[PDB]
Design a protein that fits this description.
The complex is a heterotetramer, with two copies of chain A and two copies of chain B.
Chain A: E1 3-7, E2 10-13, E3 18-25, E4 33-39, E5 45-51, E6 57-59, E7 67-72, E8 77-82, E9 91-98, E10 103-106, E11 110-115
Chain B: E1 24-26, E2 61-66, E3 70-73, E4 99-105, E5 113-117, E6 130-132, E7 139-149, E8 183-191, E9 197-201, H1 205-214, E10 222-228, E11 235-242, E12 246-249, E13 262-269
The chains are: A mainly beta (about 120), B mainly beta (about 280).
Bound molecules: chloride ion (2 copies) and sodium ion (NA) (4 copies).
One sodium ion binds near residues 30, 31, 32 and 34 of chain C.
Function (chain B): The soluble capsid protein may play a role in viral immunoevasion.
Protein name (chain B): Soluble capsid protein
Organism (chain B): Norovirus (strain Human/NoV/United States/Norwalk/1968/GI) (Hu/NV/NV/1968/US)
């Protein structure tokens, strides 16, 4: 089965940076979009996607210029580099995969808590 | 969303392992105990598996750059193919047990070139992104499977389209008959070439694009189907579709059914639900 | 008719042209000299009625079948059963690319090899409406052929490839022409790259997978036009308003659609009147 | 537009025969199925024929008594009804299906069998 596993969350000071990772395994399809979502307690919010083959990226306005998505094809891992973190960025962050237009595969999520100190 | 199948007659639909019309319903020979096709794979809730594309325009095609010795594969839209745990780029042909003859064309150039593919040698490694050029001159090409012939190796072996090729030097999973006298059901197409070739697949391609769009939740262990005559509405035979994306029946067989009928969803049932023989 | 109108929830670049078995690579509009189109493949009403030579499956698109005697190819239906000339243009699936020479890859059941069949659609011998086309050197036998690549038309000499045209099937009752409907709207086409000695882009009115969806669904056409959004599947953002009309075509008002990404999804919003004014794309 | 037009109905004596015809015009598709139906409660399918190869399919109720055929030059489909029974009284419609659904229908013709 396709498996997505996030890592890298935790407590970070507002204005700081955090890098999340998503390990993709069990994949039989050669191309797809990897996406990062988050959910606060507040419907789930799309943040960023990257096409596996050519690394085409797509960002939500909420994070454009602060978050950067990338992927390592040798390690089959997708990353979300989150800079200038805001208190409102506190959420559980999920990676997901869409083979066509729908995100059918989801990781379990990693909590990110942005603190004032 | 309720589960449904297209209201289209089978003989108007396409194979999912090559761009060929469906010409009959079939069952496998006794020696075939499972199948593991990598194209034509879609779950009942609409998840593609293997190299399966959603569109026939990508089925049994290759794309890449020859240097005269090897063809370095790309995705069919020309963007990079990245070797991974799986078998090959989306759309790559999955016909084992034969040599392929692929019609190669080029954007911006005249002419076509026949590319003859033995899938057995050490150089046939689409899992690692390359296959032998076998005389195809340097350039960028798109190829579609055109006809097949007996496999070059093992010497003297005959065509066996129940097989998949040796992609390597992580696959869509095998499909097994589930018990209760049930056998796997295949949609067959006549494949060009010197023999009388019949290519089996698990699902018509137009079922795949339907399921992938609908993504109806799989609310039971099996979907009871009727194969219906569109003139009379008569039930010509009971079938079950299973979540991994395949059909079964109990033969009395399906090969004698007319090919111009329609599969219709009737009800979710347990995996143990006993079918009336066809 | 059990379900309201919908379009497949599939990204456009994953779908196929309906005039040749080619992936969709862009959205396009026609050049200024193209005032209407009359494609015979890729024709399906919004309530699921096929028109012209259009088949429901891509496995029949831009294909021929028939028997050569060395001088003519006598056409059949693609399953080998008889083609009976009638008021219409050709057998189901027959290619409809005007303005070019065709190069058709011919194969056989029970014989090895493939053969390139070169088709000039302009001579008096090209009469698929009457069931026959010139063999142009294809030896006697039974063949199935699929369009492989194209080149400039042999006649008139020096003319350019023009895929907005259809061939001269006769020596015919055709699927009707499609016209821009007014209100600043222009026809929208799904484009595919076609191999051959140029930068050829083949337009069609509907992806083939839309046709098989509409033909199965047969959703009631309850308004004069279906308002669609072209949506980013990641963000859900509306990238542009379009109208789909009952005869089976889309329009927009360009500001254009050629600059839109090709990985979006057309989503039905509402039935509207033909007077509904679109926001420019 | 595709047009279907029946002719040939009317009054007929029991044990007799009647030949119905259905002229198909305005067609742009080269192959399809033509069917005959009748209705007295619900509509009853009687016979269908594939245009290209004349493959037929009959309801058990009329097998051996009714024959469906088609003339490709006249673009006409025929229903030959022999040894007619009182229960054959009904309004008869021809129809055409390009795929699996009869989307095109004639106007219908009354057939009245008397004894
Ligand atoms: Cl795909
Ligand atoms: Cl069809
Ligand atoms: Na190998
Ligand atoms: Na124009
Ligand atoms: Na003929
Ligand atoms: Na002509």
């Amino acid at each position: 089965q396709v498996q997505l596993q996030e890592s890298g969350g935790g407590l970070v000071q507002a204005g700081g940076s955090l890098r999340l990772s998503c390990a993709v395994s069990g994949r039989t399809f050669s191309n797809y979009y990897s996406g990062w979502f988050r959910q606060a307690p507040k419907e789930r919010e799309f943040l960023a996607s990257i096409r596996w083959s050519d690394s085409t990226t797509n960002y939500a306005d909420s994070v454009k210029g602060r978050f950067t998505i990338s992927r390592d094809t040798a390690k089959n891992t997708v990353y979300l580099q989150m800079n200038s973190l805001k208190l409102e960025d506190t959420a559980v962050y999920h990676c997901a995969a869409r083979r066509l237009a729908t995100y059918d595969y989801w990781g379990q999520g990693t909590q990110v808590t942005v603190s004032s100190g | 969303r309720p589960f449904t199948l297209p209201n289209l007659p089978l003989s108007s639909l396409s194979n999912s392992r090559a761009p060929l019309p469906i010409s009959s319903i079939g069952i496998s020979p006794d020696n075939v105990q499972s199948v593991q096709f990598q194209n034509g794979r879609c779950t009942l809730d609409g998840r593609l598996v293997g190299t399966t594309p959603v569109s026939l325009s990508h089925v049994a095609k290759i794309r890449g750059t020859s240097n005269g010795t090897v063809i370095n594969l790309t995705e069919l839209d020309g963007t990079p193919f990245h070797p991974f745990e799986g078998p090959a780029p989306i759309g790559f042909p999955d016909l084992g047990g034969c040599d392929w003859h692929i019609n190669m064309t080029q954007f911006g150039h005249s002419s076509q070139t026949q590319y003859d593919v033995d899938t057995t040698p050490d150089t046939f490694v689409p899992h690692l992104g390359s296959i032998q050029a076998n005389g195809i001159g340097s350039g960028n090409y798109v190829g579609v499977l055109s006809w097949i012939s007996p496999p070059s190796h093992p010497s003297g072996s005959q065509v066996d389209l129940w097989k998949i090729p040796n992609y390597g030097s992580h696959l869509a999973p095998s499909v097994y008959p589930p018990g209760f006298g049930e056998v796997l059901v295949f949609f067959m197409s006549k494949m060009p070439g010197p023999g009388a070739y019949n290519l089996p697949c698990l699902l018509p391609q137009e079922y795949i694009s339907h399921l992938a769009s609908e993504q109806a939740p799989t609310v039971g262990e099996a979907a009871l189907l009727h194969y219906v005559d569109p003139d009379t509405g008569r039930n010509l035979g009971e079938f079950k579709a299973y979540p991994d994306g395949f059909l079964t029946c109990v033969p009395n067989g399906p090969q004698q059914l007319p090919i111009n009928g329609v599969f219709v969803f009737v009800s979710w049932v347990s995996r143990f639900y006993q079918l009336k023989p066809v």
